[PDB]
Scaffold this active site. Structure first.
Site, PDB file in Angstrom:
ATOM      1  N   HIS A  55      19.649  37.522 -63.725  1.00 62.18           N
ATOM      2  CA  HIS A  55      20.828  38.088 -64.370  1.00 62.18           C
ATOM      3  C   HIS A  55      20.590  39.280 -65.269  1.00 62.18           C
ATOM      4  O   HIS A  55      21.532  39.784 -65.871  1.00 62.18           O
ATOM      5  CB  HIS A  55      21.546  37.009 -65.193  1.00 62.18           C
ATOM      6  CG  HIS A  55      21.961  35.817 -64.398  1.00 62.18           C
ATOM      7  ND1 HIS A  55      23.227  35.687 -63.867  1.00 62.18           N
ATOM      8  CD2 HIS A  55      21.280  34.711 -64.022  1.00 62.18           C
ATOM      9  CE1 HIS A  55      23.305  34.550 -63.196  1.00 62.18           C
ATOM     10  NE2 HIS A  55      22.138  33.942 -63.275  1.00 62.18           N
ATOM     11  N   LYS A  84      25.588  47.118 -74.480  1.00 60.97           N
ATOM     12  CA  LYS A  84      26.997  47.144 -74.062  1.00 60.97           C
ATOM     13  C   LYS A  84      27.735  48.329 -74.716  1.00 60.97           C
ATOM     14  O   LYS A  84      28.849  48.692 -74.320  1.00 60.97           O
ATOM     15  CB  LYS A  84      27.673  45.803 -74.410  1.00 60.97           C
ATOM     16  CG  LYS A  84      27.226  44.641 -73.506  1.00 60.97           C
ATOM     17  CD  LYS A  84      28.027  43.357 -73.718  1.00 60.97           C
ATOM     18  CE  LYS A  84      27.330  42.159 -73.081  1.00 60.97           C
ATOM     19  NZ  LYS A  84      27.625  42.030 -71.623  1.00 60.97           N
ATOM     20  N   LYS A 140      37.830  40.730 -64.068  1.00 60.23           N
ATOM     21  CA  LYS A 140      39.025  40.068 -64.592  1.00 60.23           C
ATOM     22  C   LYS A 140      40.088  41.092 -64.977  1.00 60.23           C
ATOM     23  O   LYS A 140      41.269  40.909 -64.697  1.00 60.23           O
ATOM     24  CB  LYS A 140      38.682  39.218 -65.831  1.00 60.23           C
ATOM     25  CG  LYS A 140      37.584  38.200 -65.603  1.00 60.23           C
ATOM     26  CD  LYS A 140      37.182  37.501 -66.895  1.00 60.23           C
ATOM     27  CE  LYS A 140      35.915  36.679 -66.674  1.00 60.23           C
ATOM     28  NZ  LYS A 140      35.359  36.403 -67.986  1.00 60.23           N
ATOM     29  N   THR A 143      31.474  40.559 -65.393  1.00 57.95           N
ATOM     30  CA  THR A 143      32.507  39.788 -64.685  1.00 57.95           C
ATOM     31  C   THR A 143      33.830  40.029 -65.382  1.00 57.95           C
ATOM     32  O   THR A 143      34.905  39.864 -64.794  1.00 57.95           O
ATOM     33  CB  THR A 143      32.217  38.268 -64.685  1.00 57.95           C
ATOM     34  OG1 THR A 143      31.759  37.891 -65.986  1.00 57.95           O
ATOM     35  CG2 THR A 143      31.167  37.924 -63.638  1.00 57.95           C
ATOM     36  N   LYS A 197      33.498  41.332 -74.928  1.00 58.43           N
ATOM     37  CA  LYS A 197      32.257  40.857 -74.321  1.00 58.43           C
ATOM     38  C   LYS A 197      31.334  40.621 -75.523  1.00 58.43           C
ATOM     39  O   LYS A 197      31.628  41.097 -76.614  1.00 58.43           O
ATOM     40  CB  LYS A 197      31.672  41.957 -73.439  1.00 58.43           C
ATOM     41  CG  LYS A 197      31.489  43.291 -74.175  1.00 58.43           C
ATOM     42  CD  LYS A 197      31.135  44.446 -73.237  1.00 58.43           C
ATOM     43  CE  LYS A 197      32.258  44.745 -72.259  1.00 58.43           C
ATOM     44  NZ  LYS A 197      31.805  44.569 -70.853  1.00 58.43           N
ATOM     45  N   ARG A 198      30.234  39.897 -75.350  1.00 52.97           N
ATOM     46  CA  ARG A 198      29.315  39.658 -76.469  1.00 52.97           C
ATOM     47  C   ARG A 198      28.885  40.991 -77.123  1.00 52.97           C
ATOM     48  O   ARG A 198      28.730  41.990 -76.427  1.00 52.97           O
ATOM     49  CB  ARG A 198      28.082  38.896 -75.964  1.00 52.97           C
ATOM     50  CG  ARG A 198      28.322  37.411 -75.713  1.00 52.97           C
ATOM     51  CD  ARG A 198      28.733  36.691 -76.986  1.00 52.97           C
ATOM     52  NE  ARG A 198      27.631  36.579 -77.941  1.00 52.97           N
ATOM     53  CZ  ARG A 198      26.748  35.580 -77.953  1.00 52.97           C
ATOM     54  NH1 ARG A 198      26.828  34.603 -77.060  1.00 52.97           N
ATOM     55  NH2 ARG A 198      25.784  35.552 -78.862  1.00 52.97           N
TER      56      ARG A 198
HETATM   57  C1  LIG Z   1      34.128  36.829 -68.377  1.00 48.70           C
HETATM   58  C2  LIG Z   1      33.564  36.498 -69.817  1.00 48.70           C
HETATM   59  C3  LIG Z   1      32.380  37.078 -70.313  1.00 48.70           C
HETATM   60  C4  LIG Z   1      31.485  38.065 -69.514  1.00 48.70           C
HETATM   61  O1  LIG Z   1      31.991  39.385 -69.788  1.00 48.70           O
HETATM   62  P1  LIG Z   1      31.253  40.784 -69.468  1.00 48.70           P
HETATM   63  O2  LIG Z   1      32.145  41.832 -69.995  1.00 48.70           O
HETATM   64  O3  LIG Z   1      30.928  40.768 -68.036  1.00 48.70           O
HETATM   65  O4  LIG Z   1      29.906  40.710 -70.313  1.00 48.70           O
HETATM   66  C5  LIG Z   1      32.010  36.843 -71.598  1.00 48.70           C
HETATM   67  N1  LIG Z   1      32.733  36.014 -72.392  1.00 48.70           N
HETATM   68  C6  LIG Z   1      33.853  35.415 -71.937  1.00 48.70           C
HETATM   69  C7  LIG Z   1      34.655  34.542 -72.907  1.00 48.70           C
HETATM   70  C8  LIG Z   1      34.294  35.662 -70.666  1.00 48.70           C
HETATM   71  O5  LIG Z   1      35.481  35.108 -70.264  1.00 48.70           O
HETATM   72  O1  LIG Z   2      25.532  37.090 -63.705  1.00 48.70           O
HETATM   73  C1  LIG Z   2      26.451  36.699 -64.694  1.00 48.70           C
HETATM   74  C2  LIG Z   2      26.229  37.589 -65.895  1.00 48.70           C
HETATM   75  O2  LIG Z   2      24.961  37.229 -66.518  1.00 48.70           O
HETATM   76  C3  LIG Z   2      24.626  37.881 -67.782  1.00 48.70           C
HETATM   77  O3  LIG Z   2      25.439  37.430 -68.877  1.00 48.70           O
HETATM   78  C4  LIG Z   2      24.611  39.467 -67.572  1.00 48.70           C
HETATM   79  O4  LIG Z   2      24.531  40.160 -68.809  1.00 48.70           O
HETATM   80  C5  LIG Z   2      25.914  39.938 -66.771  1.00 48.70           C
HETATM   81  O5  LIG Z   2      25.837  41.261 -66.319  1.00 48.70           O
HETATM   82  C6  LIG Z   2      26.191  39.108 -65.508  1.00 48.70           C
HETATM   83  O6  LIG Z   2      27.421  39.550 -65.006  1.00 48.70           O
END
Ligand SMILES: *Cc1c(COP(=O)(O)O)cnc(C)c1O
Ligand SMILES: OC[C@H]1O[C@H](O)[C@H](O)[C@@H](O)[C@@H]1O
Ligand SMILES: CC[n+]1c(C)c(C(=O)OC(C)C)c(-c2ccccc2Cl)c(C(=O)O)c1C(=O)O
Ligand SMILES: CC[n+]1c(C)c(C(=O)OC(C)C)c(-c2ccccc2Cl)c(C(=O)O)c1C(=O)O
Ligand SMILES: *Cc1c(COP(=O)(O)O)cnc(C)c1O
Ligand SMILES: OC[C@H]1O[C@H](O)[C@H](O)[C@@H](O)[C@@H]1O
EC number: 2.4.1.1
Lengths: 812, 812
Positions: free
Chosen positions: A354, A551, A657, A653, A545-546
């Site tokens: 990942h 990022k 969304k 991901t 996102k975190r």
């Molecule tokens: C989908 C999701 C993530 C992953 O987000 P990215 O922008 O791909 O790092 C992180 N936290 C939550 C609560 C999510 O629903």
């Molecule tokens: O693979 C699921 C996810 O794993 C990690 O949190 C990575 O930072 C992200 O890029 C990836 O989408």
């Protein structure tokens, strides 16, 4: 007679047939008998539980029928091993997948109750940090929906990811006590409790080796049902809990807490490796119990056939000890020859990577492994010796390659490279997005790709259209449904058909109406719950996102200060009103992440109160971002920020969304952004900045942030503001660490993408000025988001890795 | 509409009407929906749970109806505060009190299940050490049966009294993990969770005092239903659980265990004071939460009326902090004047004393109280000052009396005498047996009895005829029923009518038949579960109670060695075969108690394997004595051993259980033995040894064990055997500490009662030789055991202390 009299005991008849009358009847039964309450003293939470138990009852027959089915048929079983499962809430999801949502809604109506209000009582099952944890969750849902005999196996954390609070502009962590009022979804299974061993030592007896003198910790499994979409399939997620086995008596009883601490808290690290022994214990704990349960099930309807019946999927290297553990069991306990055992193991395991950041990968010091897991270290050394023997024969003379490929990392503190252990012990290694998988093959895993090309694959990530569309955006889901039907819910590619409506005035009006409804609803939620006022007629610019340096929330910060400085410069010049939302949690010990959260609130403190700015720009930090908040803010988003430095975000991901819910994307050519742009057409995307090759070229000659600072007046102004205390009057040097990093130690080249990012944002607002065209571009996005459904990802995993065929055939 | 639509939500209709068809239907529902299982995988434990949930459902309507009733009517409420509730198992008891036993028995029969087998799966709720804990339990049952608005309030211990194992002849303690598979009887009540404060400091502000800077621990209540006998009354036992309020993040979450440790383990001390701070915390914890809940209920349908609506009964001085806490709340928080508050407190509290041994009474060092509960110590000092002022005015010049009566004990380590705090703050103090209450008035509480005679009372203990007859001895209960009906079950005095059958050959044959059936059943149980063979045609001589020096298991030991020595002396002389059973737990840190258990097994090791002895004498230690074992062994007992040194056993309750189940009693004139002998007639009892006046006379001149050793040849032989290693060949001096104590430091004068005890035992066997006469004497005992039912004890407490009238009127 006798044993024929037990045939009565059957699931035969349940709460009826799935309608309002029986539902009310059962809600009522649960409120009195399960909650031991009555209408005069029932609390809102009680009502939530009454409803949840009534819904859960509908899962049982299917749940029992499904497991019986796999036992009868005996298909190959897929085991998804992960230390995280970011499940979010279960009530609505269960109702949706069982098609009970409307009936429950009506039954609760007739009983004078508000289902939406009740759904809000349930708290998130936040047993994950972010992407990797959510992926396991989406994957569980898709495997169920695709009729696979799949089992999610993890740890039942007493405390999930911490609840974030903002105090004084700073993040404050609070224990996530999610099991406080109980969990109506799980079902403990005492009879499947298993022993897990630690420490001890190894003695080599006549026969072979023996792991003796160990400390035991028991593993009690809790099952949670995972329903596929309307196919009557209910799979299982089995989470292990630590129990003590059975200074004085009192202290000895109090000390049982020590062994049970194993399953106490989820380590809050996202994309960062912390070598804490308690984490290593958690990893061995989930692996040891899981493998025993897998072998039990295998033995109950020799080992040659193991790989034809078992697939173990490792989510990152967290559960990598499954490789040496499976070997330990087969060699030490089942007495198979090493090589036959190794063949079995490789054929059984597959590894998913990942990330590419060095600091995010696991490298356990051997001293930690020799004392805690002495025979696993011995087995790892033997696996290493035999693997190195193979590369040596494949590349004679190349001694440095041997050194690079070794599972053992020499140096001050010798360590074991877990990623290397996984590649050596898996028949398939995979990246999570086309660009990421290719980078693996050219950089970090290059030596391995050269020795075993067949092993490396790609499996682009996805999200589930159930939770991430049907569930969180009913409005969008219904207008899409009135045009093309409902088959898209488990065939997202059908969204393609919405392209035929790009010039349809009704659909164009509807897409925009749904979006503004969501924007309105989100604004109401923020004012009710946080007393935060946001302008609904502004463009919702969202980055959730975190919090991470890679990022680049900081890049986003530079832009909002630019927007502010430009407005102050020319106050009477028109600008597209914006509500910039940034949300996400910082790992407790990540100082820069915590400073970034503070900078965001600091900026808001200035921006949000400047009278000349007024309604034109608002900067807010969305507190405690988690799966349930994502379901609320993502559907109300106009602009999705996906600005990680090219080559750092393996996939992402959240990006998917946002695309599925009608937001336009501004980002770099990183991770899955590349494939999303490809699907909708770059003309329908807002790609900007350096490409991977561009950061590499910058690295070859050296990144000098000073160059950009000397050449960009607007950038100089902002850093000057940061350094001088413009955003921190009472403590002028508050952000000196942020400024210092950006100026001299920025591994993520924020300044290098500043100009192009600002210009690209200008074009986003230019487009927003034209609602009709903004909306038509949105339609082209939603209509091409189909490839990003986890059903597709899972089908590939199934056919190209697990060797099993997906299926949408319903069970009775 | 709207709120009128919630009228549907009602308890109105339950699982039917209480018969076999609906019971089966519900058992089935629970097995599938509650246990999420089916007949193919259900484990015996699952079936036990299915049955338990089905039964529990029958409690709900009544449970809800009863609490509603007290709210509507608003009777005076009785609060039984205790740190122990030795409840034993709940399944059978619930069935019996609800009259569902036969139906459940038949419904489980038709489903091919064995209810007795299932009942054996349930483990004891052993939240008590012995007598005092069991009394609270019997009391809960009687208060329900007598229709009192009573609430049991205690601590929900995660680990009850330890499970005792015998290894190598020694006791080994094992954590009692009774909540491992869940507890189907309790119902958590999150909404009534309350905060409990610790440490901190006191600041005296304008207004009054303020307790600031405290550490908070939350108290979450769990309700368990307590059903009266067939009157449709279901009362509540509310047990508090410790929850943390909401070195780094991880450690901080792991440290929540520290605050929750408060409700972790029951201190295993019986008749012994251990001044551990964790115990003091437990005591304040149950008191603080309980008082808040009591005041809440008071406020919800000023304080002048508090005593007319509240009665707080302190079970020993364990919850004595209720006195200063009630004052703290009324003065500090409710702002009442001190004296009006004190009046209210005394009128509200009443104290029950359970022992006269100095080492068993609570004396908390003031340093422990000042740091943990600073304002309680201040209030205690003020209570002391005002109480001492009163005695000084009542007895002018008597300064030594002031010193003796002070709540504060001066010396090296200043301490607070909790018993003194209780007398000063209660309107009634009571002993638990006529002789005990009188001793209180003449010795330990003499100064207090002289200042306030009206305060001191007696309330002879009792046991519940439901659990201790109807439940544990169905055979005895049925033959008694065929002669006199069933009204005795809640009117034990009716047993008197069995005197009319003392010469009835049918009844005489039946009493003996029931006894031998029980003896047979117990023998089968011991061989099945422990592979222990006992002769069913021997006289079952039983001494079961916690192991103590004051209970004199050692005296019993001297007798069995006598029986053995006499047999070896004259092998061919006939002796009444005996199976001597001794059972009970020793407190972990009580060395002599642990040596006594070892001596018992040691004796058995010799006695049980001597060929010349054979079937004639067998000595066995009943491992892990607890409430459920009592229900098995007591009904199979012929001879009940109640041999504590006169003046040491405050009452005893096991004595009463043995009498109610058809065993003849051999004991001293101690505790309730006196009243039991009075009830049946000393001619129907086996009283022996010194009386209280006799031990006092011995104390005045000095107890010299050597005199008895020099004068009794048979005694000399035994000590010689003990000292020389006859019962411990491999470690000759193993019992030197037992011998040394007996010879020079015996506070309980074992040697002084040896001769009379041995002779009295000769007369017991003489009588046993004549079954007809042994049985007729048994009838005279059972027939006069009526005064010892807890219904009588409770009715007295109600009318003479609480000021409420008992009632057997059923609810609908
Ligand atoms: C989908 C999701 C993530 C992953 O987000 P990215 O922008 O791909 O790092 C992180 N936290 C939550 C609560 C999510 O629903
Ligand atoms: O693979 C699921 C996810 O794993 C990690 O949190 C990575 O930072 C992200 O890029 C990836 O989408
Ligand atoms: C014997 C075959 N299985 C089957 C039909 C199950 C079932 O009926 O489960 C229903 C109650 C949800 C199930 C199972 C078996 C025994 C106890 C508890 C469960 Cl949960 C499992 C498992 O390992 O979980 C099975 C398996 O495969 O071993
Ligand atoms: C408002 C009056 N009470 C009543 C009618 C109760 C009831 O219906 O209980 C049933 C569910 C077993 C009961 C109660 C009230 C609120 C929440 C939970 C309980 Cl349990 C209590 C209590 O303190 O326990 C009452 C009291 O007195 O305050
Ligand atoms: C009744 C009982 C007691 C009290 O017995 P005494 O002989 O009065 O000390 C102790 N333990 C258990 C398990 C009991 O049932
Ligand atoms: O009062 C209940 C019981 O309390 C204690 O355990 C005493 O030792 C006992 O004599 C008494 O019967």
């Amino acid at each position: 007679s006798d044993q024929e009299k037990r045939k009565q005991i059957s699931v035969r008849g349940l709460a009826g047939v799935e309608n309002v009358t029986e539902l009310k009847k059962n809600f009522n039964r649960h409120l009195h008998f399960t909650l031991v309450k009555d209408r005069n003293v029932a609390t809102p939470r009680d009502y939530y539980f009454a409803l949840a138990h009534t819904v859960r009852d509908h899962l049982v027959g299917r749940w029992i029928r499904t497991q019986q089915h796999y036992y009868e048929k005996d298909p190959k079983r897929i085991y998804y091993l992960s230390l995280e499962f970011y499940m979010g809430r279960t009530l609505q999801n269960t109702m949706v997948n069982l098609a009970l949502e409307n009936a429950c809604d009506e039954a609760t109506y007739q009983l004078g109750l508000d289902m939406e209000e009740l759904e809000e009582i349930e708290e998130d099952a936040g047993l994950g940090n972010g992407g990797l944890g959510r992926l396991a969750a989406c994957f569980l849902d898709s495997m169920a929906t695709l009729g696979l005999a799949a089992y999610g196996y993890g740890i039942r954390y007493e405390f999930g990811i911490f609840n974030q609070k903002i105090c004084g502009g700073w993040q404050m962590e609070e224990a996530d006590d999610w099991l406080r009022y109980g969990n109506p979804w799980e079902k403990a299974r005492p009879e499947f409790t298993l022993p897990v061993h630690f420490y001890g030592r190894v003695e080599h007896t006549s026969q072979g080796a023996k792991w003796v003198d160990t400390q035991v910790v028991l593993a009690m499994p809790y099952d949670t049902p995972v329903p596929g979409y309307r196919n009557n399939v209910v799979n299982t997620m089995r989470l292990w809990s630590a129990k003590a086995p059975n200074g004085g008596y009192i202290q000895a009883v109090l000390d049982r807490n020590l062994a049970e601490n194993i399953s106490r808290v989820l380590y809050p690290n996202d994309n960062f490796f912390e070598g804490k022994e308690l984490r290593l214990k958690q990893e061995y704990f989930v692996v040891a119990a899981t493998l025993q349960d897998i072998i039990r099930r295998f033995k109950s309807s020799n080992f040659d056939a193991f790989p034809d019946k078992v697939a173990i999927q490792l989510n990152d290297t967290h559960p990598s000890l499954a490789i040496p553990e499976l070997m330990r069991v087969l060699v030490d306990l089942e007495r198979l020859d090493w090589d036959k055992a190794w063949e079995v193991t490789v054929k059984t395991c597959a590894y998913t990577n990942h990330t590419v950041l060095p600091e995010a990968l696991e490298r356990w010091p051997v001293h930690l492994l020799e004392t805690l897991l002495p025979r696993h270290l011995q087995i790892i050394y033997e696996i290493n010796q035999r693997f190195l023997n193979r590369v040596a024969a494949a590349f004679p003379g190349d001694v440095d390659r041997l050194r690079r490929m070794s599972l053992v990392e020499e140096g001050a503190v010798k360590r074991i490279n877990m990623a290397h252990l996984c590649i050596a012990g898996s028949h398939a290694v995979n990246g999570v997005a086309r660009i990421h998988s290719e980078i693996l093959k050219k950089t970090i895993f290059k030596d391995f790709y050269e020795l075993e090309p067949h092993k490396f694959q790609n499996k682009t990530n996805g999200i589930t259209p159930r939770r991430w569309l049907v569930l969180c955006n009913p409005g969008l889901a219904e207008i899409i449904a009135e045009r093309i039907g409902e088959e898209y819910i488990s065939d997202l590619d059908q969204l393609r058909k919405l392209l035929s409506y790009v010039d349809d005035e009704a659909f164009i009006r509807d897409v925009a109406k749904v979006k503004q409804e969501n924007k309105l609803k989100f604004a109401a939620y923020l004012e009710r719950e946080y007393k935060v006022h946001i302008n609904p007629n502004s463009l919702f610019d969202v980055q959730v996102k975190r919090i991470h340096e890679y990022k680049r929330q900081l890049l986003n910060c530079l832009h909002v200060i630019t927007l502010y400085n430009r407005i102050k410069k020319e106050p009477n010049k028109f600008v597209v009103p914006r509500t910039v939302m940034i949300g996400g949690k910082a790992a407790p010990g990540y100082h820069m992440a915590k400073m970034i959260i503070k900078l965001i609130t600091a900026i808001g403190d200035v921006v949000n109160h400047d009278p000349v700015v007024g309604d034109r720009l608002r900067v807010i930090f969305l507190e405690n971002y988690r799966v349930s908040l994502a379901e609320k803010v993502i559907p109300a988003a106009d602009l999705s920020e996906q600005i990680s430095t090219a080559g750092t975000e393996a996939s992402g991901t959240g990006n998917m969304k946002f695309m599925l819910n009608g937001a336009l994307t501004i980002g770099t050519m990183d991770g899955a952004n590349v494939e999303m742009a490809e699907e909708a057409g770059e003309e329908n995307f807002f790609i900007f900045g350096m490409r991977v090759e561009d950061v590499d070229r910058l690295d070859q000659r050296g990144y000098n942030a000073q160059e950009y600072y000397d050449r960009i007046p607007e950038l100089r102004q902002i850093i000057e503001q940061l350094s001088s205390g413009f955003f921190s009057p009472k403590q002028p040097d508050l952000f000196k660490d942020i400024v210092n990093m950006l100026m001299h130690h920025d591994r993520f080249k924020v300044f290098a993408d500043y100009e192009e990012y600002v210009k690209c944002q200008e074009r986003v607002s230019a487009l927003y000025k034209n609602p009709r065209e903004w909306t038509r571009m949105v339609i082209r996005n939603i209509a091409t988001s189909g490839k990003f459904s986890s059903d597709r990802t899972i089908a590939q995993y199934a056919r190209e890795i697990w060797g099993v065929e997906p299926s949408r055939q319903r069970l009775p």
